[PDB]
Amino acid sequence: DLKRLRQEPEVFHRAIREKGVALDLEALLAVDEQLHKQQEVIADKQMSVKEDLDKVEPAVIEAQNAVKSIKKQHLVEVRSMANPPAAVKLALESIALLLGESTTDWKQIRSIIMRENFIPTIVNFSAEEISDAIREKMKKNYMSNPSYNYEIVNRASLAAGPMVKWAIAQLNYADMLKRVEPLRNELQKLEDDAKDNQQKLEALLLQVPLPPWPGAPVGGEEANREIKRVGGPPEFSFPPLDHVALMEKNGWWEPRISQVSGSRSYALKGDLALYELALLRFAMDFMARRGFLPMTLPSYAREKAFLGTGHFPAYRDQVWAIAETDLYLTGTAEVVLNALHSGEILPYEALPLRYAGYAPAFRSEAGSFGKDVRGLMRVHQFHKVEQYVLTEASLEASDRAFQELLENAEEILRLLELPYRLVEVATGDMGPGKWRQVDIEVYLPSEGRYRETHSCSALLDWQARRANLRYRDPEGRVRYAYTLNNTALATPRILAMLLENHQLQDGRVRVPQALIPYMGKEVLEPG
Amino acid sequence: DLKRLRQEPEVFHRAIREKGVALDLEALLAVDEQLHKQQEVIADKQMSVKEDLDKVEPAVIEAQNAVKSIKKQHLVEVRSMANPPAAVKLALESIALLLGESTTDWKQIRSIIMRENFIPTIVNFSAEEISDAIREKMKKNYMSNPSYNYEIVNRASLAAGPMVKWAIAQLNYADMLKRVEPLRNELQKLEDDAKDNQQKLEALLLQVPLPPWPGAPVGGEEANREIKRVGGPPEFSFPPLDHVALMEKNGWWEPRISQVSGSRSYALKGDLALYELALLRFAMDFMARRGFLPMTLPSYAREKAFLGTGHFPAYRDQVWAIAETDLYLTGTAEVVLNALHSGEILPYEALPLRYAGYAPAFRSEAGSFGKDVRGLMRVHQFHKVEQYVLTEASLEASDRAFQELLENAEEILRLLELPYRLVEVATGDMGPGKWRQVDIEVYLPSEGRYRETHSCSALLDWQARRANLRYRDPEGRVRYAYTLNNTALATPRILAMLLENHQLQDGRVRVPQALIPYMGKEVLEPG
Ligand SMILES: Nc1ncnc2c1ncn2[C@@H]1O[C@H](COP(=O)(O)O)[C@@H](O)[C@H]1O
Ligand SMILES: Nc1ncnc2c1ncn2[C@@H]1O[C@H](COP(=O)(O)O)[C@@H](O)[C@H]1O
């Protein structure tokens, strides 16, 4: 918000430092000021060109109607002459010259006058299409002749009089075009400087961070801090396998996929494949019982919807584009969900919107080299159910929906019988649009640590302003809404945690009580 | 198969007209035969060049081993000598010349020959480094001298003797490289023209079609035959709504999705969203119970997978590529499933492989615009459970696999309580690599007609050959397998037939008996 950025210089400097955003806020505002000055100059100069061309247009329209109104009997007593009066012959020659005729034969040119297409070509005629050669030939041969004149020619023919009128108006228009050209070329550069400034500004603006909540740790990722843990590291009395080894022992995965599809791919087999789909539906039912509206969505969107969530331009490199298309595969259903209502004024009574959106998800994982190289932790395409909340503009509403979103993910993990913890994310690790982020993490025995499975975020109105999400308040004004989101459940990474936490001594794997109705059994069969 | 193919220039020629396919079989053969010539022309010339580098290679190695094998005291002897003999001066001189530091100062030579790096760099020197002037000079100056002789100088110094063998060897080699110059130069082109034809040739082999089975109707689409019908077109005592209007009545879809994601997109809400996931699980459970192996799969693959099935290049234009990647989004799990075993020799006892793979599916829908533009009939991204079978090269095995593929699809529609019919696909309409194709279509009341939902195909060893799929038979011979496939269930298109066939008077939609246990209810609830 420009005006808000000025009246508040400190708040935004602090926000920018806190988030580790390199944003020069004065250079931004100086782009805005410079643009504004460029636009006013462009407008004065456009006016100057417009005045010039407005000078010569009426004579063209007057002559054009005069030629059209020449009677037929008059076109005939010009076509009749073998032997034209000199001032009359001058007139026709100039018309033939201008029309691009390639013959100065009088007989030949006295003819086009009664062409079915003559007037039609005269009307359609454009003075911008006159060459400088014809232009200079017109001044040398004809303007410079004392008889080449409406007054003088019109006395001799009321057919040639109009035509000399028309030819002169065109020449004058043509000479005005010529005059106006250097201002027009200039205006062209200014106009392009200005467009370039508008894109330079719009892209600074899209970097402005939300001020973070006062309770968030201040620093980079190393300032993230655990606030809670529920359950613990399992203890096995046998020597536990990691998830890859479990899937091998049991025939639950298809390693051959990396030859078909490249690295960071996975393909599940037998009871584990069925388990993945059981998990997505369990999570959708769960979210539906919770009063969130179930949705199934495409995994692609246009640029505008990545712009509105903040995925573009900041995290552009995490996104796969679809070539020879304007479409990009989405990493999360939040991009589609956030975009559904752009441009609408929601009635306050609809508030809040609570969506549980399922979509396949795609990530380039560019820049993940050496991270999670094996198994189910980090893959290119995977399946997620997302919680998305749109809310009226209060901290109270937003604090409330953030609590619910977090309890939902926790209750899901309790039902999955997995040990987890909550982590408060630092201002420098939160991302630019965030008020608060809390990550939920599940204990993964093979790495001896917790690994994220959920990220819960409140944004306030920072997505709302970018995606133009607005609502009407009880008072009758339109305001931008607040938004939040959190994962409900994503596979196959949660499968890593489930395999390792619920592995039994004989290498088989238990199903948690809440998943038994979905699976038809209490133990995954060693296919 | 080149030989086999030519062996029956009539069989392939008939397959080509039968399938309505454009492939000039004569040109392809001409290229293959012509390619065989370029390949000999290249075998020969490559040989003529090894022979020439074979005269000069062994002598350079021996000499390289001779200098490597100079005792370390013949080193002090020559490099501590104050005035040597003129033949040794000459010898060491030649070597300073070859290494690009030519001088006639014994001192400098003295100097150089002493460098720790002296030996290491002659043993590592390559005749390619020797220039024109050096060759010239080493001939005019040093080959010409009569004291420039190994034996003549291997007598005065045991250290400089091997040095002149190395210098002579390196000079003959440099000379060989020089005449082999224009020789090795012709190769580069011949070989590019050779690769060109591999490309043009294998490009055309990929156009070769399979002869259709003898009981497939001949001709175009107009010759497809209805072979069976089950259930009937519904009759309602009310005015039936079309699926888009039923979805609209019940609040089950989000039409805003086309502003976010473009045309041919869809987003389900509420009970219909849930129904979509329930259908996919239902189809998977059913396939498992039929003894097919359930799998969940990615939706992208490298080019090879598409080549292997026949999607490339025949239908490359229905496919979405992923920008700045070597990957493409697959329109059916069949592309991943068929590529899984590329390159393997499957053991006989693994056969047949029966896979029920689930993946999101993507199509560009290029060509088809002004058809099924509104609703769930033709969307860019959808969900599909696919049946895929890989079998022994046996008509017996393929025919049984095809009937079970067909019956699987038929019992799924019956269970879904949907009126359907089966259509025997004609030669001109089955696709290039098909043996048999039976389409199954479901009655859509709003449109007054059956609309395809499944295409059951047998391809014999068409895909095997393209994807290198093979098995070892009981006698222990490696043979290509036969492949088959058919859809199990695809959404959302199946939902358009469900809404409409299943719709009640009051506007709501009934859940067929088989899906009641998946939905927890008998009628779909509106928003
Ligand atoms: N490449 C990936 N592979 C598998 N799961 C992932 C991947 N990226 C993210 N996830 C999961 O999706 C959740 C939300 O991710 P994000 O939207 O990055 O917070 C994470 O906590 C993980 O559950
Ligand atoms: N663009 C699409 N939208 C919805 N369903 C589709 C689409 N393309 C194919 N299908 C479904 O998949 C079935 C078989 O597809 P195929 O694998 O192309 O033989 C069709 O008969 C439809 O049920």
State CA B147 to chain mean position distance: 64
State yes or no: is B452 an active-site residue.
yes
Q: What is the enclosing helix (H) or strand (E) of B430?
A: helix B427-430
Which burial class, exposed, middle or buried, applies to B40 when counting CB atoms under 10 A from its CB (0-12, 13-18, 19+)?
exposed
Pocket of ligand 1 contains residue A409 by CB under 6 Å: no
Ligand 1 centroid distance, CA of A259 (Å): 24
Pair of tokens at residue A342: 């752009």
Alpha carbon B242 to chain centroid distance?
43
Token couple for B430: 């089955």
CA distances (Å), A406 to each of A283, A423, B268, in order? 14, 12, 25
Looking at residue B381, the DSSP 8-state letter turns out to be E
Taking residue B115's Cβ as centre, other Cβ atoms within 10 Å add up to 10
C-beta B493 within 6 A of ligand 2? yes
| Residues in chain B, overall count | 527
Catalytic residue (choose from B79, B290, B378, B472): B378
Cβ(A180)–Cβ(A49) below 8 Å: yes
* B295, B357 Cβ separation under 8 angstroms: yes
Task: Spell out a b/e string for A292-317, using b for 16 or more CB atoms within 10 Å of the CB, else e.
Answer: bbbbbbbbbbbbbbbbbbbbbebeee
- Ligand 2 contact, B487 CB (< 6 A): yes
Q: Is B51 considered catalytic here? A: no
Q: How far apart are CA A162 and CA A65, in angstroms?
A: 9
Burial B430-441 (b: 16+ CB within 10 A, else e): bbbbbbbbbbbb
The answer on B200 and B296 residing in a single domain is: no
Bond from prior residue into B512 cis (ω within 30 degrees of 0): no
- Between helix A160-205 and helix A25-68 the angle, nearest 10°, is 160
Angle at B315 between CA B311 and CA B319, to 5 degrees: 85
A68 backbone dihedrals φ, ψ, rounded to 5°:
-60, -30
| Domain hosting residue B265, numbered range | 209-527
Considering only CB atoms, B284 lies closest to which of A265, A277, A325, namely A277
What the block records as the tokens of B346 is: 């499957």
Q: Ligand nearest A431 Cα, by number?
A: 1
Q: Is the peptide bond before B352 cis (omega within 30 degrees of 0)?
A: yes
Q: B251 is written with which tokens?
A: 């609040």
From the CA of B382, how many Å to the nearest CA of chain A? 8
- Distance CA(A445)–CA(A125), nearest Å, equals 82
Q: Which residue type is seen at B409?
A: A
Sign, Cα dihedral of B507, B511, B517, B519: negative
| Cα–Cα–Cα angle for B216, B220, B224, rounded to 5 degrees | 50
Name the amino acid, one letter, at B316. R
Assess contact for B149 and B94: CB atoms under 8 A.
no
Q: Is the peptide bond before A492 cis (omega within 30 degrees of 0)?
A: yes
Is there a contact between B35 and B198 (Cβ–Cβ < 8 Å)? yes
User: Nearest-CA residue of chain A relative to B340?
Assistant: A256
Dihedral pair phi/psi, residue B391, rounded to 5°? -135, 170
As a whole number of angstroms, the distance between CA A505 and CA A509 comes to 9
Q: How far is CA B64 from the centre of its chain?
A: 45
- What does the alpha-carbon distance between residue B389 and residue B402 come to, in Å, rounded to a whole number? 9
Q: How far apart are CA A388 and CA A290, in angstroms?
A: 13
Query: What's the Cα-to-Cα distance from B456 to each of A441, B191, B408, B430, rounded to whole Å?
Result: 45, 44, 10, 10
CB-CB contact of A360 with A310 (8 Å) = no
Q: Are residues A141 and A260 in the same domain?
A: no
Q: Kindly state the DSSP code that residue B432 receives in the 8-state scheme.
A: T
Pairing of strands A470-472, A509-510: unpaired
Task: Give the Cα separation of B384 and B360 in Å (integer).
Answer: 6
- Tokens 């005045």 identify what position? A51
Q: Which amino acid is at B187?
A: L
- Residues B49 and B59 grouped into a single domain: yes
DSSP B223-243: G-EEEEEES-----SS-PPPH
Q: Are residues B175 and B216 both part of a single domain?
A: no
Q: Which of B184, B208, B232 is the last residue of a domain?
A: B208
Written as six digits, the tokens of A297 are: 């969505």
Across-strand partners of B509?
B503, B524
* Residue where the block lists tokens 């509403």: A397
Domain boundary among B165, B180, B208: B208
What is the distance in angstroms between the Cα of A479 and the nearest Cα belonging to chain B?
21
Which amino acid is present at B73?
Answer: Q
C-beta of residue A160 within 8 angstroms of C-beta of residue A88: yes
B322 with A329: Cβ contact below 8 A: yes
- β-pairing, B268-269 vs A293-296, is antiparallel
Nearest CB neighbour to A301, from listed B260, B270, B305: B260
Using CA atoms, how far residue A150 sits from A90, A97, A158, A160, in Å, is: 11, 18, 10, 8
Interface with chain B: mutation pick from A272, A275, A276, A297, highest number of B CBs within 10 Å: A297
Same domain, B179 and B221: no
User: Residue A320: CB partners within 8 Å, gap ≥ 6?
Assistant: A328, A329, A362, A363, A364, A380, B322, B323, B325
Q: Ligand 2: which residue has its CA nearest to atom 17?
A: B332
Q: Does A393 lie in the same domain as A275?
A: yes
Under 8 Å between Cβ of A322 and B365: no
B449 catalytic residue (yes or no): no
State whether the beta carbon of B354 lies less than 6 angstroms from ligand 2: no
B455 as an active site residue: the answer is: yes
Query: If we measure between CA atoms, which residue out of A302, A319, A313 comes closest to residue A205?
Result: A313
Overall size of chain A counted in residues: 527
Same domain, A433 and A367: yes
Contact yes or no for A179/A52 (Cβ under 8 A)? yes
Q: Which atom of ligand 1 is nearest to the CA of A454?
A: 21
Phi, psi of A393 (to 5 degrees): -80, 65
Residue with CA closest to ligand 2 atom 19: B455
Q: Whose CA is nearest to atom 20 of ligand 1?
A: A453
Per-residue 3-state assignment (H helix, E strand, C coil) for B466-483 = HHCCEEECCCCCEEECEE
Binding annotation of B for ATP: 363-365, 379, 452-455
HSE-CB for B511 with a 13 A CA cutoff: 20
User: Is A487 assigned a ligand-binding role in the annotation?
Assistant: yes
At position A405, the amino acid (one-letter code) is L
Q: Are strands B293-296 and B353-362 parallel, antiparallel or unpaired?
A: parallel
What is each CA distance from A170 to A53, A103, A118, A177, B493, in whole angstroms? 12, 21, 16, 10, 63
d(C-alpha B306, C-alpha A515), whole Å? 37
Contact residues on chain B for A360, CB-CB shorter than 8 A: 299, 360
Does the CB atom of residue A358 touch ligand 1 within 6 A?
no
A115: annotated active-site residue: no
Contacts of B330 in chain A (CB under 8 A): none
In terms of Cβ atoms closer than 10 Å to its own Cβ (0-12, 13-18, 19+), residue A136 is exposed
CB B300 within 8 A of CB B282: no
Structure tokens at A107: 């007989």
Q: Are A139 and A204 members of one domain?
A: yes
User: Which residue, A208, A235, A251, sits at the end of a domain?
Assistant: A208
Which helix (H) or strand (E) element contains residue A413?
Answer: helix A395-415
Are B431 and B514 within 8 A, CB to CB? no
Number of domains in chain A: 2
What CATH number should be reported for the domain holding residue B422? 3.30.930.10
Contact A277 B278 (CB under 8 A): no
Residue nearest atom 20 in ligand 2 by C-alpha distance: B453
Measured CA to CA, the distance from residue B269 to residue B247 in angstroms comes to 9
Same domain for B214 and B200: no
Residue A391's nearest CA partner among A477, A475, A461, A334 is A461
The answer, yes or no, to whether any atom of ligand 2 lies below 6 A from the CB of B378, is yes
Beta-carbon count within 10 A of A449 CB: 10
For residue A420, what is the enclosing H or E element? strand A420-424
| Amino acid symbol at B162 | P
φ and ψ at residue B329, rounded to 5 degrees: -85, 140
Residue A437 near residue A455 (C-beta atoms within 8 A): yes
Tokens linked to B506: 């009051």
Q: Which residues pair with B383 in a beta bridge?
A: B360, B491
Distance CA A497, CA A503 (A): 10
Single-letter residue type at A38: Q
Per DSSP, helices labelled H in B126-269 are: 132-137, 150-153, 160-205, 243-250, 257-261
Residue B32's closest CA among B183, B264, B208, B236?
B208
Instruction: Tell me the DSSP string of A73-137.
Output: HHHHHHHT-SS--HHHHHHHHHHHHHTT-S---HHHHHHHTT-TTHHHHHHH--GGG--HHHHHH
Q: At what angle do helices B493-502 and B243-250 cross, to 10 degrees?
A: 80
- Residue A14, Cβ neighbours under 10 Å: how many? 16
Give phi and psi for B255, each to the nearest 5: -70, -10
Flag if B299 and A360 touch (Cβ within 8 Å).
yes
- Residue A333, Cβ density class (10 Å: 0-12 exposed, 13-18 middle, ≥19 buried): buried
CB B320 to CB A320 under 8 A? no
Buried-exposed string A242-256: b where 16+ CB fall within 10 A, e elsewhere: bbbbbbeebebbbeb
Domain co-membership, B115 together with B195: yes
Q: For tokens 């067929």, name the residue.
A: B512
**Cβ of B380 and A257 within 8 Å?**
no
Resolution stated for this PDB structure, in Å: 2.3
Same domain, B186 and B67: yes
The answer to whether A490 and A361 are in contact (CB under 8 A) is: yes
Question: Could you tell me which chain B residue has the CA closest to the CA of A358?
Answer: B273
Query: B466 and B460 in contact (C-beta within 8 Å)?
Result: no
Q: For residue B152, what are the CA distances in angstroms to A95, B77, B146, B398?
A: 101, 18, 8, 81
Are the CB atoms for A501 and A231 separated by under 8 Å?
Answer: no
Identify the experimental approach: X-ray
- Two tokens, residue A298: 């495409």
CB burial readout B1-18, b (16+ within 10 A) else e: eeeebeeeeeebeebbeb
CATH number at residue B62: 1.20.920.60
- A269–B298 C-beta distance less than 8 A: no
Q: What share of chain A is helix, strand, coil (3-state, %, to 5)?
A: 50, 15, 30
Task: State in Å, rounded, how far the first CA of chain A is from the last one.
Answer: 59
Nearest to B298 among A265, A288, A326 (CB): A265
Same domain as A363, residue A456: yes
Q: How far apart are CA A386 and CA A368, in angstroms?
A: 23
Task: Out of B455, B465, B466, B500, pick the active-site residue.
Answer: B455
Are B336 and A267 an interchain contact pair (Cβ–Cβ within 8 Å)? yes
| Strand A345-347 to A470-472 pairing | parallel
